[PDB]
Amino acid sequence: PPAVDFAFVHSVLLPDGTPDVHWRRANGGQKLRDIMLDSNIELYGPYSKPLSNCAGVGTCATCMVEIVNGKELLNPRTDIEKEKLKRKPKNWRLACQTNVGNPDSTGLVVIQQLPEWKAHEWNIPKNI
Amino acid sequence: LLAGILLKMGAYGLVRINMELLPHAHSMFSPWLLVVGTIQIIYAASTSPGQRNLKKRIAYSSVSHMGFIIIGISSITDPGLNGAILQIISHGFIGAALFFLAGTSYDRIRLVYLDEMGGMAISIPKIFTMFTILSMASLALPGMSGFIAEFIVFFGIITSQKYFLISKIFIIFVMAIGMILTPIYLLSMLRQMFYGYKLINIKNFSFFDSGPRELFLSISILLPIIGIGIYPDFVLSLASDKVESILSNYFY
Amino acid sequence: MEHTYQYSWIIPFIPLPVPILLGVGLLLFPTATKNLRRMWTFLSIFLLSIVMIFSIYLSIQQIFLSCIHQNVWSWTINNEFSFEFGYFIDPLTSIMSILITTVGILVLIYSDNYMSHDQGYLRFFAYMGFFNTSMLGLVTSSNLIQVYFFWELVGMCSYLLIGFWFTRPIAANACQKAFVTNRVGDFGLLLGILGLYWITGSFEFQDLFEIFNNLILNNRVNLLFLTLCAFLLFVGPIAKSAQFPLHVWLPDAMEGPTPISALIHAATMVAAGIFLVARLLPLFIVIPSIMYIISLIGIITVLLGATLALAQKDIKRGLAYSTMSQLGYMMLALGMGSYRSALFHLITHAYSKALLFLGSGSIIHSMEAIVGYSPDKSQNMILMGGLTKHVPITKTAFLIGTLSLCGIPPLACFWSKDEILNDSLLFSPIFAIIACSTAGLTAFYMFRIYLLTFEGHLNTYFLNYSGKKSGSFYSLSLWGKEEEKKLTMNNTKRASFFCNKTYKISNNVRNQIFITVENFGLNTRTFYYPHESDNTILFPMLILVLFTLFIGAINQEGIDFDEFLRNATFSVSIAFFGIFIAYCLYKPFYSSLLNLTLLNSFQKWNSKRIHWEKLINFVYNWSYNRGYIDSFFKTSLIESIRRLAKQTTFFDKRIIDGITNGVGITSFFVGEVTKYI
Amino acid sequence: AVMVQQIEGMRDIITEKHVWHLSDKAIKNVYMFYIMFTCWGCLYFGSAKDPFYDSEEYRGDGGDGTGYWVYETVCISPFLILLGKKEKNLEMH
Ligand code: FES
């Protein structure tokens, strides 16, 4: 079956000093917010309270996730990721405004959830 | 002095020549001058946010406040004409002080328009506080003479023997939109040239504030505005007898 | 009575000279008066204490003796004006005077320390004292002239307080919108008092009350003119008490101080509209349709003020919409004709939500040590989390305030809302059950606010969330001298160093070599937990706790000053229902008092988030877009005036300055032609 | 000065009505003293260290006291550098 290989690196470190990766499974692409809600990984952080989110429409920058090596199978920004978050390191997307695409999809996108409240920089490779 | 006293002659002459020398044709055309003054207030108060320039906003603000003088002259009443004389003196102070502070603000900041010249109130706080209080004097906002000037003009409208209720409701409504439009351009001027913060302006410029001379100019114009805005008989008591002698020719 | 009302003219003018001395001090000698920094604070507090004691003495004489004093002087005597500026001592004057003075003294005691780390100090207290001057002059006012006078001065002071922090531009947009909205109400108050002068010829609060007993029985006056005059007279209280058309100025007032949130509203200035409508109720019960209009505007804004405070991230904006919904309750009471219960609800809200704002600002000044200085950080109610463990007296004060709004009978304020719904259900069945429904919603969002602030873990120092916190707590690793000499530059450990091989997949390794270089430890390691604020913050909160416990039980003084169990238990049941719905949603599992079988079944019945995914979306989009009324006013009311301004300066500069310039252009052109002919 | 007002609606009113007016002479007197204050302030604050219109920020660059010294400065000093550039090219730079 077509299984996209999310990694979902958590924001905080382990107390040992290594990151903890969870490697979620869910099929295809419908919304990244629905995948992170369904497969039980921590999207919102402190905004995970019930009325602390816009329930998927994009009117709040609360589902933001740093995505690295995520130029392969992803939709472009819907002028809401371009507007809610503006002065960012440009690898940050809204899970309720991004989508990893079609159900026939294989890929190794790795997503750092909660780019707010983190301490690592990921040392991104310079494109082009 | 172009806005303080040179703008108010003519309006003086509309009381001097066009009201006691020619009473009956003034009674003929003051129905039209009333409507023209009500269009004048809204028109000039709406041309003022369209001005990117600083000083032109105060120029059209002067055109807007002359509408109350034209209306008080056209209001065939003692409260109308007496509020017109009060608005003559009040806006003489108001326009004089605002164009003074606009000239000093251009001399400090060297920026004419209002797309540039952002937050300058931390740079020149004395010019800011005097320009703010004199903007409040321009707002027909109380403790200031423009308030009681425009309110006695409204009272001259509402106590008119010339006009009926069909006209008076429309006149009061159009004039009272003007005291909504006047905060729009005055506070737009204030939030453009004073409110805000520019990152480049920290210590290298360090602009000189209002000196004591210009501050005496602003305070010495501000004090009779307050003294009339709390006790308006500094204007009405020296002219009410003469306005009675004027309106003796109109009411018979 | 013989010698105490003749000196009732001072209670506006007693706060005045310290803003007069600051307005000539800061404007002339800034180093001098700012060197006298804390003395003008205590001088304003002392002058307001004089006004407090004198207003208490006048209140004691009002509850003893039934009389009204109207100590009017003369202001202009030239023609038909004969204007007065006198001071009208009704029981409403006493209520409003103590309501101004007590709240103002407590906010000044609060603001001695709120502004104690502010470069802008004395001009704030000049604005405070001049606002107290203006509002005490507004409530001691014998004619609509002076109401209009101090009304617009209160609007100016609102502009100044909201744009106090003038260097930030969102406060600039806030204060411009605030003063323009207050001028839209000022507009209506103007052509409303002029319409009353055309219908009466009065300009006095005395003669209106004895003309409107028989003015509608006349043939010259029109009923249409009286009802449109009274509606325009009500447009003013719409702008002050933040009613449904003119409500968009209130939630932007947050960008200024928190004391101006406690004083511009939950206090004096939103009580200006309540004061005006309750003062003019002898000419509002007479005009038939305006009472229904006031009931209608109140019943429209109570659903707006409730649904807005449901999903606010900001503490101050949420308490602002709570204030707006309670002000809608007050206008709904004023639409009942209730001369008594409206003012009592005004008193208990103005002493309750003022305490709530001071508790919120104590929360904010505690959070400033955590997050630094930012309103999206230090005012965000989401990441406040829990502060019961840290700031206990703030917790008790804020809890007594939110129970004073949730309607708890013994140890909070309930009898006001009891009288509201009791006067509501025997009036019209449409307005009543929706008022009780909004009361349940009010208990819901207020308990939501209390749980998001004080109950639970902190949401900011929580080890699941902050990575700098996990880097700071663990100064050494779990193995000591093994696995590293410490490791920095932790590489792409997708395989977790397990040498895991790959089946049929897209990719495992590539030319992507990105090391998650984390931050270090043992640097700014402390992260000082939010301790208690000083005495100048708790002391107004203690005094307001004593107020909201003392007023909450007030053979009664209901008549001499100016269904029993079923309705009470129905209001307490719907309020506790709101408590319960907020409690099961926000109170965490380790501290809730409920049985864990029911607590498990709450998520077991609702683990879908599909029939919740539209409801939460609609409520959050409503509270975030401000019912889309903010966007519609910034789209077709102020940008419509911007387009009209550009069209009008186009007509000016192009085609009436064009004609005048074209006269000279034509003279130049005919001169150049007839030169060369 | 005491008038008891009987209104059926709320309560009785004990209006005072101290009708007064600043004496005709006193308006001339406050005008006299305010013209005196204007005189004193014009003389003294013209005799003051005027901190902006003395420095090299204002008097140095342009600073004739008009409102066009900025515009003739930025319209003539480029002509000054064009003149200096031509005189530089006159000696083959
Ligand atoms: S949940 Fe509102 S941002 Fe995705």
Q: Judge if the beta carbon of residue A98 lies within 6 A of ligand 1.
A: no
B136 by Cβ neighbours in 10 Å (0-12 / 13-18 / 19+) ranks as: buried
| CB of B219 closer than 8 Å to CB of B101 | no
CA angle C576–C580–C581, rounded 5-degree value:
120
The Cα–Cα gap between C59 and C64 comes to: 8
Task: Please name which of C356, C332, C312, C325 lies closest in space to residue C440, comparing C-alpha atoms.
Answer: C325
> Could you give the 3-state DSSP secondary structure of residue A112?
strand
| CB of B223 closer than 8 Å to CB of D19 | no
Size of interface B-C (CB pairs under 8 A): 141
Q: Which helix (H) or strand (E) holds A65?
A: strand A64-68
Task: Please name which of B155, B186, B232, B179 lies closest in space to residue B67, comparing C-alpha atoms.
Answer: B179
Longest pairwise C-alpha distance within chain C: 106
DSSP state of C68: B
Experimental approach: cryo-EM
For the beta carbon of residue C445, count every other beta carbon within 10 angstroms: 28
CA angle C555–C556–C560, rounded 5-degree value:
110
Q: Treating both helix axes as pointing N-terminal to C-terminal, what angle do C392-406 and C565-586 enclose, rounded to 10 degrees?
A: 130
Closest ligand 1 atom to residue A55 Cα is 1
Could you tell me the distance, in angstroms and rounded to a whole number, from the CA of residue A59 to the centre of ligand 1? 7
Phi then psi for C380, rounded to 5 degrees?
-80, 115
A50 is in an annotated binding site: no
CA angle B47–B48–B49, rounded 5-degree value:
100
In angstroms, the Cα distances linking C40 to A97, C35, C111, C163, C573 are: 54, 11, 12, 21, 49
**Best residue among A51, A52, A63 to mutate for probing ligand 1, ranked by most atoms within 8 Å of CB:** A63
Query: Residue B142: which of C149, C168, C648 has the nearest Cβ?
Result: C149
Given an 8 Å threshold on Cβ–Cβ distance, is D8 in contact with C71? no
The Cα–Cα gap between D4 and D14 comes to: 5
Q: Treating both helix axes as pointing N-terminal to C-terminal, what angle do C270-279 and C122-139 enclose, rounded to 10 degrees?
A: 10
Q: Treating both helix axes as pointing N-terminal to C-terminal, what angle do B55-74 and B165-193 enclose, rounded to 10 degrees?
A: 160
Given an 8 Å threshold on Cβ–Cβ distance, is B126 in contact with C27? yes
For the beta carbon of residue C392, count every other beta carbon within 10 angstroms: 12
Query: Residue B49: which of C26, C198, C642 has the nearest Cβ?
Result: C642
In angstroms, the Cα distances linking C29 to B59, B126, B212 are: 32, 11, 11
| CB of C250 closer than 8 Å to CB of C324 | yes
Distance of CA B240 to the CA centre of its chain: 21
Query: Residue C183: which of B129, B179, B233 has the nearest Cβ?
Result: B179
Touch test A–B: 3 Cβ pairs or more under 8 Å: no
Q: Which helix (H) or strand (E) holds C375?
A: helix C375-378
| Pairing verdict, β C87-89 and C69-71 | antiparallel
Given an 8 Å threshold on Cβ–Cβ distance, is B136 in contact with C642? no
Beta bridge partners of A93: A65
Instruction: State the smallest CA–CA distance between residue B90 and chain C in angstroms.
Output: 16
The Cα–Cα gap between A50 and C33 comes to: 51
Q: What is the C-alpha radius of gyration for chain D, rounded to an integer number of angstroms?
A: 33
C601 by Cβ neighbours in 10 Å (0-12 / 13-18 / 19+) ranks as: exposed
The Cα–Cα gap between C549 and C239 comes to: 31
Instruction: State the smallest CA–CA distance between residue C514 and chain A in angstroms.
Output: 5
Size of interface B-D (CB pairs under 8 A): 51
Size of interface A-C (CB pairs under 8 A): 146
The Cα–Cα gap between C629 and C247 comes to: 9
**Best residue among A53, A82, A92, A113 to mutate for probing ligand 1, ranked by most atoms within 8 Å of CB:** A53
| CB of C366 closer than 8 Å to CB of C390 | yes
C179 interfacial to chain B (CB closer than 8 Å) = yes
| CB of C270 closer than 8 Å to CB of C230 | no
Q: Which helix (H) or strand (E) holds C530?
A: none
> Could you give the 3-state DSSP secondary structure of residue B209?
coil
The Cα–Cα gap between A32 and A26 comes to: 10
CA within 13 Å, CB half, A72:
18
Phi then psi for B157, rounded to 5 degrees?
-60, -50
Given an 8 Å threshold on Cβ–Cβ distance, is A21 in contact with C490? no
Task: Please name which of C336, C302, C345, C298 lies closest in space to residue C321, comparing C-alpha atoms.
Answer: C302
Which residues have a Cβ under 8 Å from the Cβ of C6 and sit 6 or more positions away?
C71, D16
A63 is in an annotated binding site: yes
Rounded to 10 degrees, what is the CA torsion of C24, C30, C31, C32?
10
D27 interfacial to chain C (CB closer than 8 Å) = no
Handedness of CA B152, B155, B157, B160 (dihedral sign): negative
> Could you give the 3-state DSSP secondary structure of residue C483?
coil
Find where tokens 């909504």 sit: B180
> Could you give the 3-state DSSP secondary structure of residue B29?
helix
Count of residues making up chain B:
252
Could you tell me the distance, in angstroms and rounded to a whole number, from the CA of residue C312 to the centre of ligand 1? 15
Instruction: Locate C601 and state its tokens.
Output: 């079944």
For the beta carbon of residue C523, count every other beta carbon within 10 angstroms: 9
Q: Which residues of D touch B213 (CB under 8 A)?
A: 45-46, 48, 50
The Cα–Cα gap between C270 and C357 comes to: 15
The Cα–Cα gap between B175 and B36 comes to: 11
C61 interfacial to chain D (CB closer than 8 Å) = no
Query: Residue D20: which of C70, C74, C90 has the nearest Cβ?
Result: C74
In angstroms, the Cα distances linking A1 to A35, A106, C421 are: 17, 10, 62
> Could you give the 3-state DSSP secondary structure of residue A67?
strand
| CB of C474 closer than 8 Å to CB of C463 | no
| Pairing verdict, β C69-71 and A92-94 | unpaired
| CB of C47 closer than 8 Å to CB of C130 | no
Q: Judge if the beta carbon of residue A114 lies within 6 A of ligand 1.
A: no
For the beta carbon of residue B163, count every other beta carbon within 10 angstroms: 19
| CB of A125 closer than 8 Å to CB of C513 | yes
Handedness of CA B162, B167, B172, B178 (dihedral sign): negative
Write down which chains contact chain A via at least 3 CB pairs under 8 A: C
Nearest CA to ligand 1 atom 2: A54
Instruction: Locate B78 and state its tokens.
Output: 């003692």
Phi then psi for C458, rounded to 5 degrees?
-75, -20
Residue numbers preceding breaks in chain D (C to N > 2.5 A)? none
Find where tokens 């009113």 sit: D13
CA angle C176–B112–C172, rounded 5-degree value:
15
In angstroms, the Cα distances linking C279 to C155, C274, C342, C458, C462 are: 19, 8, 12, 47, 53
Task: Please name which of D14, D18, D20, D19 lies closest in space to residue D2, comparing C-alpha atoms.
Answer: D14
Could you tell me the distance, in angstroms and rounded to a whole number, from the CA of residue A55 to the centre of ligand 1? 6
Beta bridge partners of C380: C314
Burial C160-172 (b: 16+ CB within 10 A, else e): bbbbbbbebeebb
Given an 8 Å threshold on Cβ–Cβ distance, is B43 in contact with C648? yes
The Cα–Cα gap between D84 and D79 comes to: 8
Find where tokens 């009987």 sit: D6
Could you tell me the distance, in angstroms and rounded to a whole number, from the CA of residue A115 to the centre of ligand 1? 14
Instruction: Locate B117 and state its tokens.
Output: 């010249």
First to last CA, chain D: 95
For the beta carbon of residue B164, count every other beta carbon within 10 angstroms: 9
Task: Please name which of C241, C13, C52, C18 lies closest in space to residue C137, comparing C-alpha atoms.
Answer: C13
| CB of D75 closer than 8 Å to CB of D62 | no
Q: Which residues of C touch D13 (CB under 8 A)?
A: 68-70, 206
| CB of C248 closer than 8 Å to CB of C177 | yes
| Pairing verdict, β A92-94 and A64-68 | antiparallel
Closest ligand 1 atom to residue A33 Cα is 4
A101 is in an annotated binding site: no
| CB of C280 closer than 8 Å to CB of C212 | no
Phi then psi for B142, rounded to 5 degrees?
-75, 175
Handedness of CA B129, B132, B138, B141 (dihedral sign): negative
DSSP assignment of D53-65 equals TTSIIIIITS-SS
Beta bridge partners of D5: D13
> Could you give the 3-state DSSP secondary structure of residue C7?
coil
Could you tell me the distance, in angstroms and rounded to a whole number, from the CA of residue A126 to the centre of ligand 1? 29
Query: Residue A121: which of C494, C506, C517 has the nearest Cβ?
Result: C517
Name the strands in the sheet holding A92-94, side by side, starting at the edge strand that comes first in the sequence. A92-94, A64-68, A110-113
In angstroms, the Cα distances linking C653 to B50, C620, C632, C656, C660 are: 10, 46, 30, 6, 10
Q: Judge if the beta carbon of residue A32 lies within 6 A of ligand 1.
A: no
| CB of B87 closer than 8 Å to CB of B37 | no
The Cα–Cα gap between C278 and C296 comes to: 17
Phi then psi for B67, rounded to 5 degrees?
-65, -35
Q: Report the residue of chain B nearest C196, measured CA to CA.
A: B158
Phi then psi for C96, rounded to 5 degrees?
-70, -35
Beta bridge partners of C88: C70
Query: Residue C645: which of B50, B177, B180 has the nearest Cβ?
Result: B50
C146, C168, C183: best to mutate for the B interface, most B CBs within 10 A:
C183
B82 by Cβ neighbours in 10 Å (0-12 / 13-18 / 19+) ranks as: buried
Q: Which residues of C touch D10 (CB under 8 A)?
A: 68, 90, 209, 282
B165 interfacial to chain C (CB closer than 8 Å) = yes
Q: Which residues of C touch B115 (CB under 8 A)?
A: none
Distance of CA C441 to the CA centre of its chain: 18
The Cα–Cα gap between A15 and C475 comes to: 9
DSSP assignment of C178-215 equals HHHHHHHHHHHHHHHHHHHHHHT---SHHHHHHHTTTS
Given an 8 Å threshold on Cβ–Cβ distance, is B165 in contact with C171? no
Instruction: Locate C271 and state its tokens.
Output: 């009580």
CA within 13 Å, CB half, D70:
11
Task: Please name which of B150, B133, B152 lies closest in space to residue B225, comparing C-alpha atoms.
Answer: B133
| CB of C334 closer than 8 Å to CB of C274 | yes
Instruction: State the smallest CA–CA distance between residue C506 and chain A in angstroms.
Output: 5
DSSP state of C282: G
C67 by Cβ neighbours in 10 Å (0-12 / 13-18 / 19+) ranks as: middle
Find where tokens 């004409």 sit: B81
> Could you give the 3-state DSSP secondary structure of residue C141?
coil
Instruction: State the smallest CA–CA distance between residue C68 and chain D in angstroms.
Output: 5
Q: Treating both helix axes as pointing N-terminal to C-terminal, what angle do C638-655 and C629-636 enclose, rounded to 10 degrees?
A: 0
D82 by Cβ neighbours in 10 Å (0-12 / 13-18 / 19+) ranks as: exposed
**Best residue among A92, A96, A114 to mutate for probing ligand 1, ranked by most atoms within 8 Å of CB:** A96
